[PDB]
Amino acid sequence: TKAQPTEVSSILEERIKGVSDEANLNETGRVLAVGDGIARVFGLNNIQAEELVEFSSGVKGMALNLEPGQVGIVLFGSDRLVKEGELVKRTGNIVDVPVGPGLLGRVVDALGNPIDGKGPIDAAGRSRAQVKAPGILPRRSVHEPVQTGLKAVDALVPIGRGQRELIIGDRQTGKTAVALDTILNQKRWNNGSDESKKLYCVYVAVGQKRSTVAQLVQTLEQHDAMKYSIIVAATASEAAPLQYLAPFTAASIGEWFRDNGKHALIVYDDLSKQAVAYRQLSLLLRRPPGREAYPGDVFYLHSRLLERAAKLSEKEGSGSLTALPVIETQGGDVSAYIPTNVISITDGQIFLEAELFYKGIRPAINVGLSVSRVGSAAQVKALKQVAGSLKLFLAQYREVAAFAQFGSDLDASTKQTLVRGERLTQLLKQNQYSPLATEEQVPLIYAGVNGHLDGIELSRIGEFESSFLSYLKSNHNELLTEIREKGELSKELLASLKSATESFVAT
Amino acid sequence: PPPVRLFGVEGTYATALYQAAAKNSSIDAAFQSLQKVESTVKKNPKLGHLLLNPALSLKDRNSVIDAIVETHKNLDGYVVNLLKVLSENNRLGCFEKIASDFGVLNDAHNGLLKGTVTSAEPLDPKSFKRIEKALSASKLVGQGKSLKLENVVKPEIKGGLIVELGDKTVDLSISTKIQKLNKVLED
Amino acid sequence: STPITGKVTAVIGAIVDVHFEQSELPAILNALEIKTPQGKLVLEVAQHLGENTVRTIAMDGTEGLVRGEKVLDTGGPISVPVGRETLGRIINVIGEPIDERGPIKSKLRKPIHADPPSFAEQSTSAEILETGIKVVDLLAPYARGGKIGLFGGAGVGKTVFIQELINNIAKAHGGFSVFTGVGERTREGNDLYREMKETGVINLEGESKVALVFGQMNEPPGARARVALTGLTIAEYFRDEEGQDVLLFIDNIFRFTQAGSEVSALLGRIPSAVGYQPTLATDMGLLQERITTTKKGSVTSVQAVYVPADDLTDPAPATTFAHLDATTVLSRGISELGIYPAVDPLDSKSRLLDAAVVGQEHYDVASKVQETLQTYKSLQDIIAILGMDELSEQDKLTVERARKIQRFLSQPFAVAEVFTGIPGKLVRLKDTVASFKAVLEGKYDNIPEHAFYMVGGIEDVVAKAEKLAA
């Protein structure tokens, strides 16, 4: 009967009569197969696990599956220079990245080498590609705000530091846009005072071609949101081991700021393509998969990665790496396997709807399918207070608006709710790639909740907004300042806000 | 330099054994000692339930090899390398399968052919030799590789004969012709 | 046992194989110890593949492992610590410190693995239990020595409900509790630890009325399964050899399914019936019997479950539905209404229900409440197109009642002042039964619906009525 290829009768008899174990099948092993940008070599009887084996072709590939038959080595290159009868020499060193404040304003691939000719990475340490999540002892409750250009998302869905919230939806539904609002408001804290309000944002782009990503960074350099951020890339044309390794080596670059007592935020785009890379990787190394052809341990990879963003104790500086996963569902397919796993990990949702994108809410905002499993207190205390009846009007509104479209009538009080729920809906709209500080997100939500958007008609929402911000700029700009710095409203502050709203209650 | 390598799984283990012993000679000696030890093991009743049916461990196999090297003169150490390959692969049951195929390769390199003149009854010694003379004469052997044709009794055939070797067959069996006669006369 | 020499053959994720020598071979469900720079690596033997060659699942991480490294036999399974010195303390899968107060305090140890109590032993009866919440106490059939099941979606406020339950049952309970968190986050670990420092359930000095086993989701999948088993054996010691009451508590048990499904594919099986483990029936069963009320003691589980996409026709959620005695279902919709807990009482089921089972008063009240709310759910579609006005005055009254009852299931809790904001309120088993009866008879069917917003007892509703008046 059939036995493994290293036990084959021609290779085995020569070994007995020449060299066999030790420095030829122990530090070395001789390739015997190769195709699909994937090879498998015989030997390597001693080797580290997840170690990097440099083939004598000028290719390096790490090995993740070991077999006493054929050790399955994933090449980071093409196979049109890798051959059968090459020797492979062990690096002896597990896959590692440069970490530094000299990855800033620079594009780098998963091997931490410049891919835009901005030259050398000045690195203050090196760190590890696979690193376990922090424990129970290095952990601190999260209460730190994060500014986003969309007011409803920041207020209801509490966007903290050291927490994972999943932005999910289809392509071209502004998957990209939600994240970019966050980045853009962080120009203001970056410039500004207080070290612990500072994100050195790390952008991860997996399965996105070279052309699309290069346009993007130029965009962030306009808005002065790139000259402190880090861009990690793993383009589609580059090999599947490389697409899989990009999120796990980006992690180390955020993890160093966290360590030093500074803070950062990691966008993991696309977690779905990592999973596609992983599928190719495991099925050409032969691992029986689960449903949909994605392997069994796909979830184990995704859970470990996401848990590299959490908040620490004051020993490690009060630091947090913060994560926002990004998941491209097939069609709003959230019952698919990979979306069900991510979902489990993440204690909030930044749910987007496709129909609403079309309706003119660009970028689309759905806080009725958004959830917050944990308590809310990692946003600006002030924006939460004003936006305190925002939940109740938007959720009551949905029911009366559904009913109204069947031709059954209702009492005047329900139509007061319904009417208000329309005035509010218009408020949300604002074009992609635009900032909106928190300081001017406390007035408008006060104004909406106290029926000051109920003094105007359905299309006079934009004209009211223009005058009110102008009024607050002359008289109550002190009011604006206290809101941002201290974030707490008192009767005095709320009374001034009231004068401001009454003054242009009409138009 | 395989004279005619076999693809089939363990027709390749035969190929491997051949090349190794062919470049260090002593293949006719090896095969001859090998055939003898295989016949004397199988007809010994200890390994007539245990190398006839492999049912021994890994460690218990090596100790079988150690008892085996008393049994014959090894004669070429590449057949001693075969014992190490099979004990490691944890069978001793496809030991004689490699040997049989190795034998064919060995006699083929020397330039000898082994064929069959299957019939349902044996013929005249005259009949056999004429058929041999004809095959060498005919333009299907150059007269470069020597001839053996072996008469056998198969029960399949109902009369007539088929000469077979090398995937050249000359078919004048009646067995098939009778069957077709019935069909066509029950049409 | 004495030293046993094995050599690693393959590192393939977690899956790690060994090549033991003849006549000195381990057996299935052992714990192997490997000297490593990763401490002591433990492998749980899960198969033999033949020829003195095994196939194992890891219990500690597989980073920088070198093939050919010597593999020991403990002689048996991982043995964690069980005691009454395991109260408060935080314990991991291999029974190794994660609360970093030095080694975990033991009197005895037992292996993770054990036998499900036998039928001769069984002394299982169902006796009314309570938590202090109205929807739960009246309209959910919880019983003591039952196996309560908190079915729900993701993020519908699962953590809040669980927080509230430990907060109540444990302080009041004469015994202890044992909390196991299977494949939950490091956010959740500090938060559970934190909430119970504050309520005083955990004291660093004396004993505690709760224990912790925090197993996290970045841990290798084989290890993920036996966080549940680790915690489970402590519950047994409480029941058996101390002869105390304890109330087991687990969080989420879907993570337990998930974890078998992963190590199933790798062991070489196929996870069939929608990408979930085949061996669900026998592993579920092991757990269920093991949690029981015998003549030794009482262990009553409250088990968290996550239903993917609120799909109860996926085979993984559904089998579990039968095995959890006193099911409840939590829905997103009730949370958004500001109704607390997320419980829908028109979805709670126990296998058998009568007037003797739960008692005569209890039955009659709980049936009447459900029909008024069930008639409302039926009429909602009708009313959407035809309108309320095409139905009767009577129909309108069954509707007006169902709403006042509906907001009578709101109750803000003290540990949801970080979630909601509104003060703590609790209602006992006695107070709920007596009061719900009054309402149906029509004594409080004149008090506004929004005066049942955020109330406890009957008393709050009257006080909140005065507040809408003034």
Next chain:
Amino acid sequence: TPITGKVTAVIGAIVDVHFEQSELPAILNALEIKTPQGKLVLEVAQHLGENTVRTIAMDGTEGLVRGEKVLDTGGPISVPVGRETLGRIINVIGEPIDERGPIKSKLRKPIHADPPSFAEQSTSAEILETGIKVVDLLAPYARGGKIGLFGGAGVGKTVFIQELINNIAKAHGGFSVFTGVGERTREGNDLYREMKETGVINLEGESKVALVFGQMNEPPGARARVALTGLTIAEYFRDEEGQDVLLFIDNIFRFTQAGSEVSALLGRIPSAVGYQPTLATDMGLLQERITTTKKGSVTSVQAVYVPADDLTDPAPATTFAHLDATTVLSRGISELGIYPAVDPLDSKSRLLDAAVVGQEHYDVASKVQETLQTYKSLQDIIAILGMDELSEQDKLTVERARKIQRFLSQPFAVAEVFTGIPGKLVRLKDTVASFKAVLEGKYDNIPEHAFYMVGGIEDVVAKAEKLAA
């Protein structure tokens, strides 16, 4: 170096060679099987070991004797490129399918190449005009832009690509490349003639249009590397020379499709429901070799055949990722007699989602989308009950939407038998003005039928006048 060997196996169309030499060539090299009916040119994809490779076969695979000589020619198959490959048709092997003697060439370049790097590729959008209103409104085309079509083929596909060639590629001063990977040879013959008549091919000499056609009657491996052949030609014009180009493909699904078939044969497990696990990798590499460099800037239009019109299908899904604008086109929309056959509630672009095409333009798309979505969302209540059972407000919006819905109907200039009717064409600026007015109710008061199959605003009025007499 010539490596003599024998063909051990004809395992389907992915034939395997076993050389009787201890040397081996590198993967992606070429081999010639010495058969008495010509040759087969094949390319190595696996080393399995012991001097037995598996090679993908790009030429017909019947009549292969097992035991037949192979020779190693070394390295990739070489196509013909230059100014003399202009007007020509190329198969997959550098061979013409319209004859006239061979392709005249200077350079023969390997079909397996490296794609230009990140420093050398950035996306653009500089605004071309399409004489087709529906594209301008919903997903305006632009130079550098990456366009994609989806849903079925033979529903109007071909008509639409020709309209694009008609306006933008006859006003393009660079070369233009048509590559149809495994296209249906009838349509091919029709296209060659008409282009040569309308002057954009002339003889074998200089041209503004050059052509490449796959034949789909060839074996799976050949179909896969038609795609590779056509990319080589485009690279040359864009890259070496540095001249501007265009590229049109119908269908690239074919490329992906071929891959799934060969996957099974190579040694891989095919990913579930009949695709390849190397799906992502191949798809990226092909779309990275033609996208906008810095040496040239090439607008590519890609058409994806969808076997169900559903984008949840993974092949269409990873395509949709690598485009900046999309115009998902659907079979249902054709059968409803809407030409252009483009979805209006499924077309989007990343220059129109941020106002980089202008405020007045963005504003004009925004309203149009909201009306049209109201109509579909309240479509059940609309068929089952009428419009006097609905609010007057509601009834007005639905009335406007239907009129907008008809207005998007315009016949192509290239249609005269695909719509019946000789086309009408409008500008980008004209299309914007027209819609703007319409939202303001100026021409909502004259038939819906007046908006159907006509051009500009003026034409609508003019057919309403016809309808009253």
